[PDB]
Paper text:
The C-ring is tightly attached to the MS-ring, which consists of ~34 FliF molecules with two transmembrane helices. FliF contains three ring-building motifs (RBM1, RBM2, and RBM3) and β-collar in the periplasmic region between the two transmembrane helices.
They were separated into two classes in the 2D class averages, with them showing either 35- or 34-fold rotational symmetry on the S-ring. No other symmetry in the 2D class averages was observed, indicating that the purified MS-ring consisted of 35 or 34 subunits of the FliFG fusion proteins, and there was no other variation. The monomeric structures in the S-ring part from the 35- and 34-mer structures are almost identical (RMSD = 0.286 Å). The difference in the outer and inner circumferences derived from these diameters is approximately 2.4 nm and 0.7 nm, respectively, which are roughly equal to the calculated differences produced by one subunit.
Residue numbers in the entry:
A (entry chain 3), B (entry chain 2), C (entry chain 1), D (entry chain Z), E (entry chain 4): 254 to 327, 367 to 402, 418 to 453
The structure:
Amino acid sequence: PASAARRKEQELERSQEQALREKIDSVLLPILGYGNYTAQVDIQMDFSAVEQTRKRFDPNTPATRSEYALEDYNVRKESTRNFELDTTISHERKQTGTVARQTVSVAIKDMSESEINAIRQVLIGTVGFDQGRGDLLNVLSVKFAE
Amino acid sequence: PASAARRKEQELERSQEQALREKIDSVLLPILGYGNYTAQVDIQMDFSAVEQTRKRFDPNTPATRSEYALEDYNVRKESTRNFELDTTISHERKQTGTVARQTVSVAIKDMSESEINAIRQVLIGTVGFDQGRGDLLNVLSVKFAE
Amino acid sequence: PASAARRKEQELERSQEQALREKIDSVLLPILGYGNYTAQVDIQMDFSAVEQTRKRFDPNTPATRSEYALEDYNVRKESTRNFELDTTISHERKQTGTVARQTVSVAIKDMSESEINAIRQVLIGTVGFDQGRGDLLNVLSVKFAE
Amino acid sequence: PASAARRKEQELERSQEQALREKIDSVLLPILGYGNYTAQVDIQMDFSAVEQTRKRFDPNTPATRSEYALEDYNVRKESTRNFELDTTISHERKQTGTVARQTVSVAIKDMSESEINAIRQVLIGTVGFDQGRGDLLNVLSVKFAE
Amino acid sequence: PASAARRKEQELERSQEQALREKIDSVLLPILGYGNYTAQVDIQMDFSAVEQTRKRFDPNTPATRSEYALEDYNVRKESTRNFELDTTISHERKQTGTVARQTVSVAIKDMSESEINAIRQVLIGTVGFDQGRGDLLNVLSVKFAE
């Protein structure tokens, strides 16, 4: 029944996180080294279904088709005009599974501020940090344990 | 009958908690160590079904189609106009199983305030702490037993 | 017949309590120890069935379609206008088995006030104590028997 | 025939009492000891069947559809307006077997007032004592026999 | 069912990234050397479906077909004209899978500013950096590990 329509979304969300983690590991491994960093990510998405239909008009450019006028003097002023305007019709079907938010957190074993800024700048391209969706990207250094 | 439509939600909710716990363990294990921390999470969700239909209009941009006027002087002032406006139709089907609230609690075996703040900042990205849904995230340190 | 529609709810309610007790035990066991605490929980739920249908209108943004006017002077002032407004239709089906109230009671074998407050703060995240549903959470220390 | 529709309720009521007694025993046994307390509970419930249908309106936000006016001076003042309002329809089916009242009585073998208050506070969470349904919870200490 | 309509998009997006990475590697390998650089890319795309229908008119060039006039003097001035205008009809079906954004990040093992600018200029042609889609291209040099 419907028990399979949600678990598929659950596995898809997990697969996205796994791919993002794999992409993250490829960049930080040769620069920081093995076992000198930890990172985890998560993605939240929605599976709604939206259909849109739009019909627009242009009132600034009217075109006349039939026109009748009467200008009786002595004072009758009668006018009857027909107009035809531009018509635009649009039909749109949205996607299902758009990414809503994305959070990335990176911890580096103990670094000055310049190196942290450089690492953040490098990771920005690798991740796709975008402010429109309210994504969060944090990178920081702490002392590990032995 | 309907006895299977709720137990599926119960197993799905448990599976979400298990995955979140597994993600939590991966980050805190190498930094804090084995047996130096405990953490548990819970998620509350709803399984409603909402359908939406919207029809919008634009009254600020009217377009004229037929127009008749009479300006008899001597004083008859008659007007008859027909208008056509923009039409927009939208149909939306919402998802079933959206997350409502999320609570995370972390206890660390005995730490200064800076380390606690750093750990909270690290866990924020790993969990997905969001203030819009009223999620709760608490991290603190207590003395364990022997 | 209908003798099975209520016993299923009875087993579901018992299963929820068992899972909550298991979650409680996992956190308090390593911090307090074996046999130094007791705790029990209960959950009350309802199994009603509610369907909702809503139809909303926007009276602040009217759009004119047909308009006729007469401004006879000498003083006839006649007007006839047709309007079209935004229409919104919503249909909602609620869930069956929502949690109404939740009570948790914890007794610790003999503790200062700070440790009690810390334990309560830890258990708040583990349980999901929410004031909207009027949930109750009590933690206290008493002297056991030998 | 109908001889089975009531005995099922009788066994369900007995099963609820048995489960509540089992939950009570689990908490008081390690704190008070074996054979130092006695307790019994009862639950009263109803098995009615109620269906509800509601139709609500919003008179404070009317929307105009058709309007005709006449303001003849010399003094005829005629108006004809049509309105459309928000419509809400709800259908609800209640549950069968809601708990009406609940009484708990606890006797402890001979205790100061503080210990009695602490025991009552512990049992409140374990039972679910609620004042809305007029539930009764009594705990007291008497001298047993030998 | 629909579980295959999204995984295909997931593999297509991964294939685009793989091809872009392969193109990147071909240029930077002979100039920088083996193991002296790291780079990763990502592409975000949408899979909507848009159909467009347009009907345009030219009101500045009207052509007369039938004309009747009356210029009675003594003063009746009556005119009745019919017009025919240019008509244009367009139907368009958009593509599915257009690229929305593109981010590239390059790190070079430790370089002056001139060499960095030259490398960025070289990579601009190889990637296709375009400001219309808000693409991001970052190139920088950091100290690696040993």
